[PDB]
Amino acid sequence: MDFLDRNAAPLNEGEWQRIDEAVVSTARRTLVARRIIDVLGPLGSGVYSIPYSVFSGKSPTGIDMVGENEEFVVEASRRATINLPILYKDFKIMWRDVEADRHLGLPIDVSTAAVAGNFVAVQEDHLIFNGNVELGHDG
Amino acid sequence: MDFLDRNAAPLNEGEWQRIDEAVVSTARRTLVARRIIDVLGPLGSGVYSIPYSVFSGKSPTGIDMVGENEEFVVEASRRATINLPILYKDFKIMWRDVEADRHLGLPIDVSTAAVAGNFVAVQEDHLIFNGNVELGHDGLFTVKDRQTVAISDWNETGAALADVVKAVGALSQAGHYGPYAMVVSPVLFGRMIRVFGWTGMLELDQVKALITGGVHYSNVIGGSKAVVVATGSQNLNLALGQDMVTAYMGPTSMNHVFRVLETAALLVRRPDAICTIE
Amino acid sequence: MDFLDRNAAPLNEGEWQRIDEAVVSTARRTLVARRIIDVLGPLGSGVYSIPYSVFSGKSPTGIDMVGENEEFVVEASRRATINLPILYKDFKIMWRDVEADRHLGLPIDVSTAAVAGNFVAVQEDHLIFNGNVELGHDGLFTVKDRQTVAISDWNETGAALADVVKAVGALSQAGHYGPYAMVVSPVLFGRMIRVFGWTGMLELDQVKALITGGVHYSNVIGGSKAVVVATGSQNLNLALGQDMVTAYMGPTSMNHVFRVLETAALLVRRPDAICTIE
Amino acid sequence: MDFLDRNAAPLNEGEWQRIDEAVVSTARRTLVARRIIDVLGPLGSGVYSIPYSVFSGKSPTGIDMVGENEEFVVEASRRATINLPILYKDFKIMWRDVEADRHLGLPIDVSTAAVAGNFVAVQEDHLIFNGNVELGHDGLFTVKDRQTVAISDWNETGAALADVVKAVGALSQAGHYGPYAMVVSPVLFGRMIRVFGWTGMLELDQVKALITGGVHYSNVIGGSKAVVVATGSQNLNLALGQDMVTAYMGPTSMNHVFRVLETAALLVRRPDAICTIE
């Protein structure tokens, strides 16, 4: 992916792997929704909005030796759409800490990244359960 | 030149070539001044200020069989220098539209850049017609030496031709023969679209036949005003420092911010070569 | 573009050529909007929805001697997105004829395909000009921030020219200079054909001298109304997904059913760039 | 093409050619219908009958997000078939005149051939506009599902324009947008040549601006009647069979005798495309 700048930053891959693992593990601890609800995708950055069918209707099932009838199609009661918001939060790693890890081996204070991961995970859950007014997302 | 980060923005040069085109094609649409007033330069970014002569006065010409007296030198009624400000506006290509180009193929919404280019061009015109108070510039409606003509009620037929004739009168008496050009606020320009007498053409066609440099219009000029110019680099020029260009500013937030900028200013070399009808 | 089964119909490619030309030669003779408004793309099949930016309102341009203030940023009045509907109608080639009139030496009767192309281009116009209620598409005659001019009684001479002048006033006041274009209901267009003044040429041609991007009519515009549009991809685009094409739909009985479709929507990028005379 | 028997006539190629050119050119000067109804074919030779379709009624049009409903079909409302009669007239060339025009140097008299061509073409037009009872053919004034408009007194100023506006209204209601063409009896056409009024143009030139397919006159439209046609091969056709040709038909006395023949028939694919003003 292009948008994700990972080369102008000073941090090595041995830092990135720690930071991402601290985010992933903090999410997997924090989240409730990805227990009750399955992940779809992931789809990449570029999908701004998704078309999705609404079924919301009760209809029978076919039961015959050859199944002549075609009454039994599942009907999309409405084929609506939704736009995918960004949830984000931002955190600083001090230049002192970077230069320390780059000479003295003192590891980055990735607890910042963990705190950001926790806060975005909380916002993900809040979006899912409570919805949001301004985005118009029903929850 | 290095002050514009043509390689630091994420955009490929095809997208640069679409963004510059989406600026230039709205500059050319929007600008009136460059149709009236000749461009001087462009000079490059470094030219922070320009000295210019102001021949506001009149002084006698010699006539002699011998050709000896030296009183008959032209002065410069004042000499002055004017500073070129930066005109600029910022347009903000949001980051996920880049990925939507990268993978969904739907190209970038450069219409932000077009709207910025329009806002820059409108500021260029606004500066040239009405010099900014804070910078202490003067423009064609603020120059104090200029000719003036009392505007009539152009709701009457032929009154716009009459006032144009007055303005060509005053310009001629100032020593400025044509070709004149004129710019009209659109509330009057609409009133110039009438049949005139039985002459078998519009009143505007009379004015365009007399004002052979053409009649233009802009909402930049206040309502019920017009300005008439004895065209040519002899009388007015528009200096360009850096001609209108697009410059990056790095990422601000995740989004990519770009600046459209131009440095230009009006030097009124002959303040008697202008009449405002008002 | 793969979902159209050129190979599953019985028709050979010469018989496809016949019917595609039968569609295109009826579309060209009826499409207005593609002559008023720029085609975006076409984006290709099934590009289901398009994000776009609406730039109503204004904010100040920066003029300063050095670039130090970041307030001067372009932001849309809203980020927006629109759903591309399908326009379609079907026609049913009878299976007998496909080898009956073959041995009459008749080329396949394409007449229903022409009728389908017609009804497609009619629904296209009806969507673009008049919007749609069910899909919620706003059209040129419905978008709420547009300019409006109260129409004069065009039974007078020059009244239509005066209303066109009013419309170009309301567009130019908003900073949208030409080339404009106009589309008029034929009940009005039939009264714009008048000899004007002593000029010896038509009021409609005076308008075309002013509205240089062209004047047109389509019966879709109900009653006495017209719309004047500041042309160009900066102001409006016709979004095309699937450009108009014919698609096979398999047998039915043994008769062959064909579909003609296009997917298109109106991108009102600038509501203020439109004025309706009504 | 055995029935032409061109070798059995005495005439050489240069003697024959002018007889065909005399026929063809007078047909071109006479055939009104082929200006406004498209020729189909010509087909084979003499082919006895053709199947065709009537698309009466007006199904709605598909605007939908998915394309689901299949009701939007051109519903072939009823099948039909028609038989192509021969139209013919015979012209006769005396052996005395042949010999005089071969030894006595005179050019061969062909003044009969063009009169046969004329009486043929006038019969073809009378067929197309008025049908034929004995064959059960119907024409533009006799097809049953056509629109009608009550003709006003075309001695009043503007009456013909107003009635054509009514007819174009009715065709618009049928969903036939243009281009329209129209054919008028001479008694009315001589009433369309008036100054329409202060509009300053002939009423006929108003109608020609509204009826862009052109206005025509013909003998076969008896009395105060006119017809308006939503042109194009999707609404009407003329099917020729054998396009107008001369056949040698064997001596009587020593006089050579020739036949001019035609096989055209009217296909009324959409009886709603026709309005008669009567």
Chains in touch with A (3+ beta-carbon pairs under 8 Å) read: B, C, D
Subunits with 3+ Cβ pairs within 8 Å of C are: A, B, D
3-state helix, strand, coil in chain B (%, to 5): 30, 25, 45
Quick one: which H or E segment has residue C223?
none
Q: How many CA atoms does the CB half-sphere of D127 hold within 13 Å?
A: 27
Hey, what are C55's tokens?
A: 């730039």
DSSP states of B92-114: EE-HHHHHHHHTT-----THHHH
From chain D, pick out residues whose CB is under 8 angstroms from the CB of C257: 73
Rg (CA), chain B: 23
Give the whole-angstrom CA distance, residue D159 versus residue B44: 71
Q: Quick one: tokens of C92? A: 């049913």
Residue in chain C closest to A52 (alpha carbons) equals C48
Task: Please enumerate residues of A whose Cβ is less than 8 A from a Cβ of D.
Answer: 76, 79
Sign of CA dihedral C210, C211, C213, C219: negative
Q: Which of A5, A7, A43, A45 to mutate to test the interface with B (most CBs of B within 10 A)?
A: A45
CB-CB neighbors (< 8 A) of A76 in chain D: 66
The C-alpha atoms of residue B52 and residue B269 are separated, in whole angstroms, by 7
How far is residue D52's CA from residue D41's CA, in Å, rounded to a whole number? 14
Q: Which contiguous run of DSSP H or E holds residue D6?
A: none
Give the residue among B77, B96, B125 at the shortest CA–CA distance from B255: B96
Picking from C231, C225, C125, C224, the residue whose alpha carbon sits closest to that of residue C168 is: C231
SS3 B249: strand
Contact D175 C120 (CB under 8 A): no
Q: Rg of chain A's alpha carbons, rounded to an integer?
A: 22
Cα C173 to chain centroid distance, Å, stands at 25
* Nearest alpha-carbon partner for C204 in C140, C157, C147: C157
H-helix or E-strand spanning residue C53: strand C49-54
- How far, in Å, CA of B173 to CA of B164, rounded? 14
Distance CA C215, CA C229 (A): 11
Tell me which chain C residues have a C-beta less than 8 angstroms from the C-beta of D50. Answer: 104, 106
This structure's resolution (angstroms)? 3.6
DSSP codes joined into one string, D14-67: HHHHHHHHHHHHHHHHH-SHHHHS-EE---TTT--EEEEEE--S----EEESS-
Q: Do B108 and B15 contact (CB within 8 A), yes or no? A: yes
CA distance linking residue B168 with residue B179, whole number of Å: 10
CA distance C86 to chain D (A): 6
For residue D64, what are the β-bridge partners?
Answer: C86
Q: Which residues on adjacent β-strands are paired with residue C267?
A: C237
Farthest CA pair distance, chain C: 83
Q: Which residue of chain C comes nearest to D40, CA vs CA?
A: C106
Alpha-carbon A65 to chain mean position: 46
C138 close to C144: Cβ distance less than 8 angstroms: yes
d(CA C169, CA B190): 7
C137 CB-near residues (< 8 Å, 6+ apart)? C82, C85, C127, C131, C265, C266
What are the beta bridge partners of residue C49? Answer: C83
Amino acid at A81: T
How many angstroms separate the CA atoms of B244 and B116, rounded? Answer: 11
Method: cryo-EM
CB A115 within 8 A of CB A92: no
Which residues are CB-contacts of C123 (< 8 A; sequence separation ≥ 6)? C87, C89, D61, D62, D63
Under an 8 A CB cutoff, do C48 and A51 touch? yes
Question: Between β-strands B215-217 and B180-184, what pairing exists: parallel, antiparallel or unpaired?
Answer: parallel
Please tell me what DSSP assigns to residue D2: G
CB pairs under 8 A between A and C: 10
Chain B partners within 8 Å of C199 (Cβ): 195, 200-201
Among D197, D120, D200, which residue's Cα sits nearest to residue D162?
D197
- B34 vs B264: CA distance, rounded Å: 11
Residue C202 pairs in a beta bridge with C195
Are C72 and D53 within 8 A, CB to CB?
A: no
3-state secondary structure of A116: helix
Q: Which residues of C touch D (CB under 8 A)?
A: 26, 29-30, 83, 85-92, 94, 97, 100-101, 104-106, 109, 111-112, 114-116, 118-120, 122-123, 127, 132, 134-135, 157, 190, 193-195, 218-219, 257, 259, 261
Other Cβ atoms within 10 Å of B199 Cβ, number: 14
The residue with tokens 């950055």 is A45
Q: How far is CA D145 from CA A124, D77, D229, in A?
A: 66, 13, 14
Q: Taking CB atoms and an 8 Å limit, are B96 and A3 in contact across chains?
A: yes
Give B24's contacts (C-beta < 8 A, 6+ positions apart): B117, B244
Instruction: Provide the phi-psi class of B253: left if phi over 0, else alpha when psi is between -120 and 50, else beta.
Output: left
Amino acid at site B262: E
Nearest chain C residue to D52 by CA: give it: C109
- Which residue in chain C is spatially nearest to B111 when comparing CA positions? C234
Whether residue C271 is preceded by a cis peptide bond, meaning omega within 30 degrees of 0, is no
Task: Show residues of chain B in contact with C269, CB under 8 Å.
Answer: 111
The span from the CA of C9 to the CA of C1, in Å, is 17
Of B10, B99, B251, the CB nearest to A45: B99
**Could you give the CA distance from residue D38 to residue D23 in angstroms, rounded to a whole number?**
20
Q: Which residues of B touch A5 (CB under 8 A)?
A: 251
